[PDB]
Amino acid sequence: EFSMKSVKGLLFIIASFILTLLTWMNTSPQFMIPGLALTSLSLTFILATRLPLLESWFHSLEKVYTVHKFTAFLSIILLIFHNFSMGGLWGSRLAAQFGNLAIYIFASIILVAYLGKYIQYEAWRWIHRLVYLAYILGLFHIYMIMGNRLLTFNLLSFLVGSYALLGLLAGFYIIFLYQKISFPYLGKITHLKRLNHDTREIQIHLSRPFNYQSGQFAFLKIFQEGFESAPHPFSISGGHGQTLYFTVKTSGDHTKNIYDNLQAGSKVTLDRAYGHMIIEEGRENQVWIAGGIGITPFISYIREHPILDKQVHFYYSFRGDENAVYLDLLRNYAQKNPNFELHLIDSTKDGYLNFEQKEVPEHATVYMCGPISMMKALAKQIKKQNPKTELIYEGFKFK
């Protein structure tokens, strides 16, 4: 659920609407519903830019995309009501037909985005990118309809023009510029290690130092023959300065490509570090819960803090010893640091991790990274045990 950490973002959205609502009501009340929709459209584009300000305001990329979806849905309902109030299925003049086309494209794209989950990610993104054409058609329709009412010196013209320009610039940046100018970290793969039957470790040497906190993730683009160049999100699993580590598990065609065919010497590019699950910013008493590949952020901490300063209880749940990674590393960390307690849960033979009887230390932050059902069950159990415990979790998907 949303908390105060996103309030700066939320007040940005609400003030975006109220200021819109009071503007149209002052000038053209008959257009409050469509005008608000226009705002709700531009915000949507702004929520797709992945800018650091958005992450700061909404505290997380997952919350950013939740608000993105909510604004998209609000826009589509407002536009459907506007269409029902002002016309039919097809207009008689070009200005109205532009709006007809824009609303049709918006509805089709929203339906495909919500109901298309097994579509390939790149094909999904290509279909999703038609929102820019729908938005341009909508702006054309608005400006032919209004004429010399958005082209004067008043609050309405400045509001509509500023929001439209912000949406246009955000869409152009995310669709055309972001993958070509916002990936300044140029690196080369130096070493590859297959940790088990379906996980591989990638070591990257960069031309510039990379700054990140343990528990954060980045977007990686690989440039090798037979590989897709699209950016994939991966947790930074280690490295300091010009060296980076990524631990990639086979989860599809691209990750299987990484496992079998990736080679040392291949060029890679990275944009920056994202994430709110910063372990070093938590309380002294800590509980770490990982499931499968969700161990990747915690490993970063272990790799970057040879001496532990916190009271850490780590629960690592895996399906059999063949699905476990970094077991020797965790055992060495436990042996070297007496303040690091390690609990390995072979869920194949032990069963699911249950926290109803397990005791959490007082005044503690819990970090969870695993399958979403596991996180939900453990969060319910821990909240039932102690409502004052801090709970932080990281999801491995945006939609």
Ligand X SMILES: Cc1cc2nc3c(=O)[nH]c(=O)nc-3n(C[C@H](O)[C@H](O)[C@H](O)COP(=O)(O)OP(=O)(O)OC[C@H]3O[C@@H](n4cnc5c(N)ncnc54)[C@H](O)[C@@H]3O)c2cc1C
Ligand Y SMILES: NC(=O)C1=CN([C@@H]2O[C@H](COP(=O)(O)OP(=O)(O)OC[C@H]3O[C@@H](n4cnc5c(N)ncnc54)[C@H](O)[C@@H]3O)[C@@H](O)[C@H]2O)C=CC1
Residue 247: name its binding partner from ligand X, ligand Y, ligand HEM, none (Cβ under 5 to 8 Å by kind).
Answer: ligand X
**SS3 string of 20-51?**
HHHHHHHHCHHHHHHHHHHHHHHHHHHCCCCC
Residue nearest to ligand X (CB): 252
Rounded-to-integer distance, Cα 257 and Cα 225, Å: 11
The contacts of residue 308 (CB under 8 Å, 6+ apart) are 333, 337, 339, 340
Position 24 contacts ligand X (CB under 6 A): no
Kindly state the tokens that stand for 286. 């800590």
One-letter identity of residue 332: N
Residues across the chain: 399
111-132 burial code (b ≥16 CB/10 A, e <16): eebeeeeeeeeeebeeebeebb
**317 labeled binding residue:** yes
Position 294 contacts ligand Y (CB under 6 A): yes
Query: By C-beta, is 146 or 308 nearer to ligand HEM?
Result: 146
Query: By C-beta, is 34 or 238 nearer to ligand HEM?
Result: 34
Site string for ligand Y, 200-239 (x = CB under 6 A): ----------------------------------------
- Bridge partners of 349? none
Residue 96: name its binding partner from ligand X, ligand HEM, ligand Y, none (Cβ under 5 to 8 Å by kind).
Answer: ligand HEM
Query: By C-beta, is 99 or 291 nearer to ligand Y?
Result: 291
Residue 87: name its binding partner from ligand X, ligand Y, ligand HEM, none (Cβ under 5 to 8 Å by kind).
Answer: ligand HEM
One-letter identity of residue 356: E
**75 labeled binding residue:** no
3-class DSSP state for residue 88? Answer: coil
Site string for ligand X, 270-299 (x = CB under 6 A): -----------------------x--x---
How far from the centroid of its chain's Cα atoms is residue 10's Cα?
17
- Bridge partners of 202? 192, 246
Site string for ligand Y, 249-268 (x = CB under 6 A): x-x-----------------
Nearest to 123 by CA among 132, 131, 113, 133: 113
One-letter identity of residue 354: N
Tell the smallest beta-carbon distance from residue 350 to ligand Y (Å). Answer: 9
Residue 137 near residue 108, CB atoms below 8 Å: no
Site of interaction with ligand HEM (CB under 6 A): 31, 34-35, 37-38, 44-45, 48, 65, 68-69, 72, 75, 79, 82-83, 86-88, 91, 93, 96, 99-100, 102-103, 106, 110, 113-114, 125, 128-129, 131, 138, 141-142, 145-146, 171, 174-175, 398-399
One-letter identity of residue 343: H
- Please pick, from the candidates 158, 176, 352, 398, the single residue that binds ligand Y as defined by CB under 6 A: 352
To 10 degrees, what angle do helices 121-128 and 94-115 make?
160
Position 399 contacts ligand Y (CB under 6 A): no
**396 labeled binding residue:** yes
Tell the smallest beta-carbon distance from residue 40 to ligand HEM (Å). Answer: 9
**149 labeled binding residue:** no
Rounded-to-integer distance, Cα 336 and Cα 347, Å: 26
Contact residues: ligand X, CB under 6 A: 121, 217, 230, 232-235, 247-249, 251-255, 293, 296, 396-398
Binding residues for ligand Y (CB under 6 A)? 249, 251, 291-294, 317-319, 347, 352-353, 369-374, 377, 394-396
